[PDB]
Structure 1
């Protein structure tokens, strides 16, 4: 009280000092039963990669994904993630992962970025502004470059307009740059929109074929199916605990709920995004979550000018649980339960008379002992 009041002397009164909150104990992790190696080798160690204008797309789901085995390898020239920190990728669960693979020139790797403009960024591959995921680029001069010239790789050079995000264009039609319509016949101001590459081992950096794969995720759209390699544990009830239900992290006490989830229901909230129910991934049991007790604490003193004894009131908190350590006022000191909360250090009497410092709900305290 002296510390928070900025004085060495306090007069008779009641002052609100601080707050208390029950400290959580242990932790709970719950992940689904399903487990199987996620097929990353096939998309990464693929013998053949599609062209940039025809980038190969794959959807990955129902697997256990480990990303440390990809971070550790230094074979990748560029490893840049956007919405998530890479080191945390092993602690999140997603669903419907998307992988895209293609090959470009050395200097075009900058074009694979949200909010970018150039040749590929608008005519071959377009990324959404708010894209979340990661991009991987590595050198492929030793396999994708040929002495006789590489012509299997073509890029779209001419188009009517820019591409939408995640748009694939494969149509090869003569482009009319001038006013004269080509009418399906190549002529003046008519050019083929697809141009082949000149990949050669003689060429230096900036022209060697580089292999690029992009990974895209979702964020809480459905029951996740792509979890990371984390070991689950058991669950406990009626204890203020930290919980991590399938990536949803929080703190509180868990109770056997009685609200009837429909088979398509996963969790529940009532007002203002307060998740107060959940279904565990393994047992498929409905439980409800409520925060463990917390509240303000105040003191009652007759003025340091007179004495040094004080009383402590915990506001709106049941007397059953109380032990800011202050275990001294938790062993055998007199305890009382009032409508305002719980009072420690004061003696309850049956004498009623006009009173000093008020407390609440018709109860008030004074110094005779307190």
Structure 2
């Protein structure tokens, strides 16, 4: 049984499409704008291959990042400087109401664009591609945090009248009610009645006092062990 929430079930990775290799074996020269297993001059990396912008020094062949990653290359067989970037990789997370309520789920690809994703409607959000959530323009108080101000919930979407689809709806958060109090230069609001309100506040005080003997865990009563 699952309870309501986003749960981060696994990761995601986009596989390279075609292998390309060059030399100064044989050469399959260039595939562009796809995750490719490039092999330039004996260096093999899996990354999207794109044209390079900035002007290299004539001797300088490989462009380097601040963290020493290579972000550009020079073709050893043909001559062109190519920008190098990583292929997309995020972590899938399953949004689901409480399994008691329903077995409908939606998925969230936590960084990728909806072009990369391999479920009838998709929603491109700042968090990631949200598949299985019917976007609505109404606003409620947050139920399940996707992020960038949007939260998902289990509500009636009003497909035809209200077909009781109760599908997962992703809506931008409502901060709270809107109140109408006006500034006036000579008016004061004085209460005439009062209420006695009792509330409860819960505070943790202590946790369970645990003891773990090192020898029993590490060596498990072995005489040879512990030396």
- Common topology (TM > 0.5): yes
Other-structure match for 1:355: 142
Other-structure match for 2:176: none
Listed as ranges, the gaps of 5+ residues in structure 2 are 156-166, 169-227
Aligned residue for 2:142, secondary structure, equals: coil
Aligned residue for 2:139, secondary structure, equals: coil
Per-residue Cα deviation, 1:322-369 (whole angstroms, up to 9, x for no partner): 11xxxxx3xxx1111112111111111121122311211111011122
Listed as ranges, the gaps of 5+ residues in structure 1 are 1-8, 33-229, 324-328
Are residues 1:367 and 2:154 paired? yes
After TM superposition, give the deviation of residue 259 of structure 1 in Å: 1.2
Aligned residue runs from structure 1 range 78-157, under 5 A: none
After TM superposition, give the deviation of residue 268 of structure 1 in Å: 1.5
Are residues 1:285 and 2:86 paired? no
Which of the pair is proportionally richer in strand? 2
Please give the TM-score of this superposition, normalised by the length of structure 1.
0.41
2: CA distance between counterparts of 1:258 and 1:334? 37
Aligned residue for 1:298, secondary structure, equals: strand
Aligned residue for 1:19, secondary structure, equals: coil
Aligned residue runs from structure 1 range 332-347, under 5 A: 333-347=120-134
Specify which structure has the bigger relative contact order, considering alpha-carbon pairs within 8 angstroms and separated by 6 or more residues. 1
8 A Cα contact 2:18 2:31, kept in partner: no
8 A Cα contact 2:22 2:41, kept in partner: yes
Are residues 1:27 and 2:15 paired? no
- CA RMSD of superposed structures (Å): 1.2
The one of 41, 45, 50 equivalent to 1:255 is: 50
Are residues 1:315 and 2:99 paired? no
Aligned residue runs from structure 1 range 225-304, under 5 A: 230-304=25-99
Aligned residue for 2:10, secondary structure, equals: strand
After TM superposition, give the deviation of residue 233 of structure 1 in Å: 2.0
Per-residue Cα deviation, 1:93-146 (whole angstroms, up to 9, x for no partner): xxxxxxxxxxxxxxxxxxxxxxxxxxxxxxxxxxxxxxxxxxxxxxxxxxxxxx
Other-structure match for 1:11: 3
Look at both structures and tell me which one has the larger radius of gyration over its CA atoms. 1
Aligned residue for 1:294, secondary structure, equals: coil
Aligned residue for 2:103, secondary structure, equals: coil
Which of the pair is proportionally richer in helix? 1
2: CA distance between counterparts of 1:256 and 1:362? 36
2: CA distance between counterparts of 1:270 and 1:14? 35
Please give the TM-score of this superposition, normalised by the length of structure 2.
0.66
Other-structure match for 2:192: none
2: CA distance between counterparts of 1:231 and 1:342? 39
After TM superposition, give the deviation of residue 317 of structure 1 in Å: 1.4
